[PDB]
Design a protein around this ligand. Structure first.
Ligand code: NI
Ligand code: NI
Lengths: 132, 564, 100, 100, 100, 66
């Protein structure tokens, strides 16, 4: 109310917050095939997560988890979880992580074909050991 | 004539074969060698030997190599020299000699370079232990006051980073970017410890790394908090090799981009310093400890797990849960099995350095204390190391000492100037009373001047009257504090004129020899065994042998000595 | 006595808690600094007395109540942290929600 | 009150000895700092009370025993020295082997 | 507890007055610093207790007598001033001729 | 074999040779630019590191006979 708020407290409105609303969502199925727990955050390039995670890696190309900024998803050993994926914004330029892309992850301009740098990436994942 | 040992000792302290108890521990050191003859013993006082024309030379000007300072009849505990009794001599803020001091006019057997003269002052080492000052490789620059807590436990060199109490500093040992670096270089001018600063390693091209290199860093710190990626590692190490600087790492605890094995592969056999190698302080869970098997890894532990005690699990649990404002991250982070294992591996010479992690889970004023505390808990549980000699604990003690002295130095490429009591080195020295060894020093000698000391009432008729508490001294004063302190930098920076550009009055010294080193170059801690960790029960096997010990109830050099 | 910076700093705690304990015994409702003092010293003294971190924690989370403090102080003290010197060494004690 | 550095410094002694005297009265065996505190203040207070250096010395050499201290502390306290303010001025008091 | 310089400074007062009150209770006649301490803390504590400036003033001007002090100390303490934290804030308290 | 010595492989002949690992850091730069890195085993007994498999694949398609 105001009469009830603690010292330094907040009076929060009611309306929920809506985030990532515009962005197209890809669901992938993720199995942890290692013996150790794996935890992945909101802004990590899902494509490039721990080799031991087995999922449709091609589908995670240019993608992140569609969760709250700063939060994470925990993949315990030998468990299966479905996760929502969304594309990165801005320029869709991804440098670093596991050095799988080190570039542009966008779709480009041709609907119903793949860019060759994507197929390169995907091939390279495969032979660096990134489970699909 | 003939004199009894007991009478001799009382005059001059212990000689070859005599044994000294290090506090309230069960560690006993033994004097291996006596370098300062018999019958011509140099002591300062009224009616004594270091008087004009007698033990002291009275005709030689200083340019004849007469000393500026002499420390007499002292027991030297050093990881490279061992346990010896000698005179120690200082000239131009450097160690000129270890041997027999005096006047060659009237004395036989004066070590060259150890001529006492008109220029010479004196310290009476008879009942004292002399060490190299410690070096703390894992400093968070959260609070300037840490320096005082450090000097007060016998640490005089800081390696790390920060920019005061920012959230980034609270978590990592990073001084990010050329502006912040410059700022921080300038600030530390006000501190009575040596410093080298670490930079942010998490970068994709060379640009952002090179920047910081030239700005003056001695290293790059790769931290999870800013991304502990393969990318980070790879580019950091490649730059490092270019710049002759070090890389330190705090690995991915969440296993997000990989497991430990993948991290290892990111190192790409390149020299690296690994902080809190056990993992309680961060790292690939449960099994970051396996990096201690690799020849390219220079491993360190932070000091809150050493020694392993009965309250250790309770503490750590609760600490993370506040450190990270938080339970399956918790009980996976905090593993009794690996903590015990850390303790054992230390004793084996498999983890090569102690560190603090200052005000980011460890204790800046407890590195010398905890080292000794660990050695003593471990003697109790394990007995004598195989290489120990039956009557003494020298092998052991000396392993431990290497951990806070020479090994850190080597890791950060400063063993050429600091870390051991050896000829040609900066006199960064600590004096201890055996009774107080590790805990409470007498003094710190910082660039050849006493900078810090236990001092009582300045109004009193002596220096000893109560209250006795640690206080700055003249080396800690004025323009001398800068003159006597080093700011470590990159050769890149040195060559680019960092000293002028930044306007530093400190001594500015280039780090060197960081990238060609391996685990085997480390002193008394050069072991690379097979390490296995059980992903269920977190049990550690070292060459197939279960690595554990039981927690201590009672620590030595602890509640007896401290009000804290 | 060769007092280190950590040792000297702790004298502030002892001085403020003595004042605080005198005030509480007069029936004064305590303020923020005062309350933090009493919880801190309770821990510290436990440590010295030879207790476990676990045990001191309990003890310190029970010394002060809502009644014993000025309205709102609770909101100001969500947790208290201090390093104390236990038999096995220096250890961090967090005391969670001490004013219940 | 125009407190001089010497005056201010002496407050540390008073604070640590109050803590120390409380601990001893709980039956705690004292440590090094604590024990040094109690001997120091005994002297100091004697001085203030109007005694001689000779007399305070005796008094202070008798306040603590081996039983009252933690094993070994004696070895850590061979002598205690303090300057106190006697009727005739400031004087150094050495107290020889105070823990008998 | 987030102690400010003003807060820390006031610990000196508390420490000297504790010593002073112990001495007065032994029958020692107080000196200048000690006497100033007792008057100062009396005010300070009143403030905390919720009294008025007017009321604390009276209280503090009555705590010490000529008998309770060493001859001449009165001449050294014509007035005592302290800032205390009253319900309405920090306020200066002057205490006029406190040793009557 | 002895430091500084060599083994001669004449045309169309078969010889068995003893092999041993390199020491130090096991960092191999240059030669035919097949590795230009770390050649160690790493920490996982009964798997291969992927940079090794990369190397081996690359040999194959640069023409290095197996
Ligand atoms: Ni870390
Ligand atoms: Ni750290």
């Amino acid at each position: 109310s105001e009469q009830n708020t603690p010292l330094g407290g907040c009076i929060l409105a009611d309306t929920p917050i809506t985030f990532n609303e515009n962005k197209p969502v890809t669901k992938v199925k993720v199995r942890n095939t290692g013996d150790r727990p794996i935890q992945v955050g909101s802004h990590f390039h899902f494509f490039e997560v721990n080799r031991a995670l087995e999922f449709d890696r091609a589908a995670a190309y240019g993608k992140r988890l569609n969760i709250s900024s700063t939060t994470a998803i925990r993949f315990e050993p030998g468990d299966e979880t479905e996760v929502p994926l969304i594309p990165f914004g801005g320029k869709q330029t991804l440098y670093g992580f596991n050095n799988l892309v080190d570039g542009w992850t966008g779709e480009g301009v041709v609907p119903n074909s793949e860019r060759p740098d994507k197929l390169e990436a995907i091939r390279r994942a495969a032979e660096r050991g990134f489970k699909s | 004539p003939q004199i009894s040992r007991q009478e001799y000792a009382g005059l001059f302290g212990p000689t070859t074969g005599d044994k000294i108890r290090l506090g309230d521990t069960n560690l006993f050191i033994e004097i291996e060698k006596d370098l300062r003859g018999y019958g011509e013993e140099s002591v300062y006082g009224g009616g004594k030997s270091l008087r004009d024309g007698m033990g002291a030379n009275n005709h030689l000007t200083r340019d004849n190599g007469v000393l500026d300072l002499v420390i007499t009849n002292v027991t030297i505990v050093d990881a490279r020299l061992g346990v010896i009794k000698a005179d120690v001599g200082i000239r131009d803020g450097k160690i000129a000699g270890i041997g027999k001091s005096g006047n060659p006019g009237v004395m036989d057997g004066v070590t060259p370079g150890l001529v006492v003269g008109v220029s010479t002052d004196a310290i009476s080492g008879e009942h004292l232990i002399l060490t190299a000052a410690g070096i703390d490789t894992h400093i968070h620059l959260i609070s300037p006051q840490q320096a005082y807590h450090a000097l007060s436990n016998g640490v005089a060199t800081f390696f790390g980073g920060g920019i005061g109490p920012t959230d980034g500093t609270n978590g990592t040992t990073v001084t990010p970017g050329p502006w912040n670096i410059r700022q921080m270089l300038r600030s530390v001018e006000g501190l009575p410890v040596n410093v080298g600063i670490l930079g942010k390693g998490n970068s994709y091209g060379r640009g952002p790394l090179l920047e910081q290199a030239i700005a003056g860093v001695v290293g790059y710190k790769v931290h999870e908090d800013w991304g502990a990626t393969a990318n980070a590692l790879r580019h950091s190490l490649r730059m490092a090799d270019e710049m002759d600087i070090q890389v330190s790492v705090h690995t991915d605890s969440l296993n997000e981009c990989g497991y430990v094995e993948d991290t290892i592969d990111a190192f790409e056999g390149r020299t690296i310093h690994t902080f809190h190698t056990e993992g309680a302080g961060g790292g690939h869970a449960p099994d970051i400890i396996r990096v201690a098997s690799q020849p390219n890894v220079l491993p360190s532990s932070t000091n809150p797990t050493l020694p392993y005690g009965v309250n250790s699990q309770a503490e750590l649990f609760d600490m993370i849960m506040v450190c990270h404002n938080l339970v399956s991250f918790a009980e996976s982070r905090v593993r009794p099995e690996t903590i015990a294992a850390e303790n054992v591996l230390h004793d084996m010479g498999v983890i090569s350095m102690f560190s603090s992690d200052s005000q980011a889970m460890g204790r800046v004023g407890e590195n010398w204390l905890r080292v000794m505390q660990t050695a003593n808990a471990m003697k109790a549980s394990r007995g004598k190391l195989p290489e120990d000699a039956p009557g003494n604990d020298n092998f052991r003690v000396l392993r431990y000492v290497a951990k806070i002295t020479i090994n850190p130095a080597i890791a950060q490429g400063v063993s050429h100037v600091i870390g051991s009591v050896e000829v040609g080195k900066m006199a960064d020295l600590v004096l201890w009373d055996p009774r107080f060894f590790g805990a409470k020093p007498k003094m710190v000698i910082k660039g050849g001047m006493i900078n810090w000391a236990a001092m009582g009432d300045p109004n009193a008729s002596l220096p000893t009257p109560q209250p006795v508490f640690y206080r700055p001294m003249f080396g800690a004063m004025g323009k001398t504090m800068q003159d006597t302190c080093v700011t470590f930098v990159s050769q890149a920076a040195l060559d680019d004129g960092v000293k002028e550009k930044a306007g530093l009055d400190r001594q500015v010294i280039a780090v060197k020899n960081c990238r060609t080193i391996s685990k085997h170059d480390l002193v008394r801690n050069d072991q690379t065994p097979n390490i296995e960790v059980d992903p269920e029960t977190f049990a550690v096997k070292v060459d197939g042998v279960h690595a554990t010990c039981e927690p201590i109830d009672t620590a030595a050099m602890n509640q007896r000595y401290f009000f804290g | 006595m060769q007092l280190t910076p950590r040792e000297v700093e702790k004298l502030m705690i002892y001085t403020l808690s003595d004042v605080a304990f005198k005030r509480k015994a007069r029936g004064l409702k305590l303020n923020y600094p005062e309350a933090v003092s009493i919880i801190t010293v309770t821990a510290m003294e436990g440590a010295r007395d030879g207790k476990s971190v676990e045990d001191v924690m309990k003890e310190a989370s029970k010394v002060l109540t809502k009644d014993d403090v000025m309205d709102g102080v609770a909101d100001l003290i969500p947790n208290v942290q201090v390093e104390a010197i236990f038999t096995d060494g220096s250890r961090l004690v967090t005391v969670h929600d001490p004013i219940k």
